[PDB]
């Protein structure tokens, strides 16, 4: 119809904006493609039979108000599309993702669409629960403020009995590390059931957190077949007095992440969430949905502790693209920073933050890269990228905390972590005899 490209339209502060990385077919112009992304998202352009005079025209339609090409690239652009607030149910993302990415990417005259960024207003953020706790409630809940939190992903994920799994929980907890995690297949399985895993993990925490004097925890994977199996898997973690559990928000979806987020606030359990099935969606630079949407579609659906990824092997260009959604994960207001990839000024309305979990190799020397970039406001998983530790999991756990708590301590002496970050770990490998063998 080309009534969905109104380029003069100033966006309302209560509209829901979306930045589509539009790549049309080569016989399609930029204005007809962008008017087609805005149309079939809400009100399709199949026929015009006697309904152009009917119910609501200027209401209730996604309208494209902006087209800009991508620098250095052709046959593609970025369409900004304004959705009114009254399209969606208040408090869900399963209605965000049915107008904005539902029936949108399968238009025939478009080669590849990618939802880059999305502007949730204050008028729609305030209905959402947000995460069940903050970036600051769970420093307070766990009495671990002053340094980023830690992890030990148990690397033999498949083939461990629940007690032998609960030793690999225990010695990564007995040393330095705080939050040892179930992996993505550490679930119910014939080799260990979750009823028995949660038992033997809860004894691993209770012994470790009572001989090392901290509030240590385990990310209990409560991803299940049903929502009723999941809450029964979550409520059994409540009965063990567990601080944190684990959800998988893209496999299980954005209903059974919200229920568990409604569960985790109601029952005081923290909600770590792994980004399973995310690189089905995030990976291609021309098609899919960027993770910054799904990192902002978790801060509203609910959950602390999102994995953000290795900033180790990334260049200085994709470092800020990671730091685009990480500042959209931990802060309350951002600006329009396209060098960081952020396409919309996002006002979070003091809805609580989400910790930035980061798999950081095993590499002890890659700690000050992960402390200057990710501050005290993050979590550092230490599985993947692992040569192992030649003295074991437990002195390999202190060698991942004395590596941290001297790097955090060197941030607090007025030193820096890019000019002399490696000059702190071997400075600390003199005192602690367990750092110098990890290397």
């Amino acid at each position: 119809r080309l009534t969905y490209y109104t380029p003069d339209y100033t966006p309302k502060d209560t509209d829901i904006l979306a930045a589509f990385r539009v790549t049309p077919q080569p016989g399609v112009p930029f204005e007809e493609a962008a008017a087609a992304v805005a149309a079939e998202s809400s009100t399709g352009t199949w026929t015009t039979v006697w309904t152009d005079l009917l119910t609501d025209l200027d209401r209730y339609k996604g309208r494209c108000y902006d087209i800009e090409p991508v620098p250095g690239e052709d046959n593609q652009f970025i369409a900004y599309i304004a959705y009114p607030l009254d399209l969606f149910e208040e408090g869900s993302i399963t209605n965000v993702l049915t107008s904005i990415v539902g029936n949108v990417f399968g238009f025939k005259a478009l080669r590849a669409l990618r939802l880059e960024d999305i502007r949730f207003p204050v008028a729609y953020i305030k209905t959402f629960q947000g995460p069940p706790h903050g970036i600051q409630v769970e420093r307070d809940k766990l009495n671990k403020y002053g340094r980023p939190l830690l992890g030990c992903t148990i690397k033999p994920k498949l083939g461990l009995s629940a007690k032998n799994y609960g030793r690999a929980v225990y010695e990564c907890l007995r040393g330095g590390l705080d939050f040892t995690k179930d992996d993505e297949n550490i679930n119910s399985a014939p080799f260990q059931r979750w009823r028995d895993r949660f038992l033997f993990v809860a004894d691993a925490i209770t012994k470790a957190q009572a001989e090392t004097g901290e509030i240590k925890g385990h990310y209990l994977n409560v991803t299940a077949p049903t929502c009723e199996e999941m809450l029964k898997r979550a409520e059994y973690a409540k009965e063990l007095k567990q601080p944190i559990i684990m959800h998988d928000y893209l496999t299980a979806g954005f209903t059974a992440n919200t229920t568990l987020a409604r569960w985790c606030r109601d029952n005081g359990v923290l909600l770590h969430i792994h980004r399973a099935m995310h690189a089905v969606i995030d990976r291609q630079k021309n098609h899919g949905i960027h993770f910054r949407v799904l990192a902002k579609a978790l801060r509203l659906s609910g959950g602390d502790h999102i994995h953000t990824g290795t900033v180790v092997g990334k260049l200085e260009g994709e470092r800020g693209i990671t730091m685009g959604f990480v500042d959209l994960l931990r802060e309350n207001y951002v600006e329009q920073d396209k060098s960081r990839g952020i396409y919309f000024t996002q006002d979070w309305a003091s809805l609580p933050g989400v910790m930035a979990v980061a798999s950081g190799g095993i590499h002890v020397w890659h700690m000050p890269a992960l402390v200057e970039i990710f501050g005290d406001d993050s979590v550092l998983q230490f599985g993947g990228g692992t040569l192992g530790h030649p003295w074991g999991n437990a002195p390999g756990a202190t060698a991942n905390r004395v590596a941290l708590e001297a790097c955090v301590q060197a941030r607090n002496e007025g030193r820096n972590l890019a000019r002399e970050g490696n000059d702190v770990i071997r400075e600390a490998a003199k005192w602690s005899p367990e750092l110098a063998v990890a290397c």
């Binding site: 009495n143 403020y145 002053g146 437990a394 708590e405 955090v408 002496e413 007025g414």
Partner: protein, 106 residues
Amino acid sequence: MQTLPKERRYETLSYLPPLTDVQIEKQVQYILSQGYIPAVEFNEVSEPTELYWTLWKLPLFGAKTSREVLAEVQSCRSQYPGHYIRVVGFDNIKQCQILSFIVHKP
């Protein structure tokens, strides 16, 4: 192949060797240099259950130096020698809390 000794260590910045008084100046100085105004707390037993430790005085705020914080911690630990003292950082601009580190353990 050295084992890990059974040590009930403490919450943050505590796997290091015990802090020399030069380093205790520098830690609270970065607590000062964020535009932030520090505070002192103490307790007897460091439990995971016990989240609260007893405040020493009111939190210190004004235009002061790091040596005016250690007058409470270092120069005035004589009435609680056998207790666990730490420095608290009550980040009120973001409603946060920064850099617990336990000082002068018995």
